[PDB]
């Protein structure tokens, strides 16, 4: 059973005020639900569709199209490490190996306690300071495999 909160509904309606079509607030509505709850559960698709006045299949297609909208449950902190070409030249593979060693999981998986979710991601637009990673809202540059275990403990 899913129910949109009053703050979620108000934020979604204020987002629909920004466009001449209420369908244009679907990505922001999904991001609002994701920000409030960590991810987008199954009933959230129908709730957002009911608020916006669009079919739930359109909301589901939008949610499954975009990689930063999570339709599966994630951990309390999401690590997104860059695996693109400049960070490949700068050696993201050591960072990925260090992350897999410390968290004892694979990319696309979450930890046993639900603390961390490891994910590869596209280029973060910080290629001159590579390698880069994006934990929940903070981007970290100039990464080294030695600094990864120190960096992970500051996200409790």
């Amino acid at each position: 059973a899913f129910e949109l909160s009053a703050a979620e509904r108000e934020a979604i309606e204020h987002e629909m005020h920004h466009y001449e079509d209420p369908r244009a607030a679907s990505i922001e509505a999904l991001k609002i639900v994701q920000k409030q709850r960590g991810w987008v559960p199954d009933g959230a698709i129908h709730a957002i569709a009911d608020v916006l006045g669009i079919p739930a299949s359109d909301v589901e297609g939008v949610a499954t199209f975009y990689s930063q909208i999570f339709r599966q449950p994630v951990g309390r902190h999401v690590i997104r490490y860059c695996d693109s070409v400049v960070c490949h030249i700068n050696g993201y593979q050591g960072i990925q190996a260090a992350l897999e060693k410390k968290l004892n999981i694979k990319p696309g998986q979450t930890t046993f306690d639900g603390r961390f979710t490891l994910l590869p991601t596209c280029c973060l637009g910080n290629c001159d300071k590579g390698p880069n990673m994006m934990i929940d809202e903070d981007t970290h540059a100039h990464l080294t495999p030695e600094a990864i275990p120190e960096l992970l403990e500051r996200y409790k």
Binding site: D21, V62, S67, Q68, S84, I89, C123, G130
Partner: protein, 146 residues
């Protein structure tokens, strides 16, 4: 908006302009202009066939113009200093300056503003400092991954 530079009756002209910021949800194809228009409309970011171009029928069927950040940042210098100043920055076919820079195992990986017609050796050596210690040059991509 507080200073009256945006909104209704901008500096007494009567021109009304409202500016919004629309944050994306992580997809590379959204940078394509028609796929950008599709993503702005709350749809899956599939591109569109041209013709018709977005200037005729773009966002929500209305006339729409899509421009990069750097183009719109080049615009106010043209409108403030003049056309003849902008044409005389560089003695090349491409007018004005451009943000150029070398990245990836160089001494100074960064970003600088250079006139068009600058050779790629000056960006690598005179600005980025050449390659690092013990590494020799093999190849380079001029304009990104594509």
């Amino acid at each position: 908006t507080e200073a009256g530079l945006l909104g209704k009756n901008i500096m007494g002209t009567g021109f009304d302009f409202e500016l919004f910021v629309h944050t994306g949800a992580g997809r590379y194809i959204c940078g394509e202009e028609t796929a950008l228009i599709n993503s702005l409309e709350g749809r899956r970011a599939n591109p569109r066939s041209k013709p018709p171009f977005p200037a005729t029928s773009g966002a929500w069927g209305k006339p729409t113009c899509v421009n990069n950040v750097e183009t719109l940042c080049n615009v106010p210098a043209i409108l403030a200093n003049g056309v003849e100043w902008y044409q005389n920055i560089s003695k090349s076919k491409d007018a004005g300056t451009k943000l150029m820079g070398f990245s990836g195992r160089v001494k100074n990986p960064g970003l600088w503003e250079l006139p068009f017609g600058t050779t790629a050796r000056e960006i690598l050596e005179d600005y980025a400092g050449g390659m690092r210690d013990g590494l020799k040059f093999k190849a380079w991509q001029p304009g990104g991954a594509g």
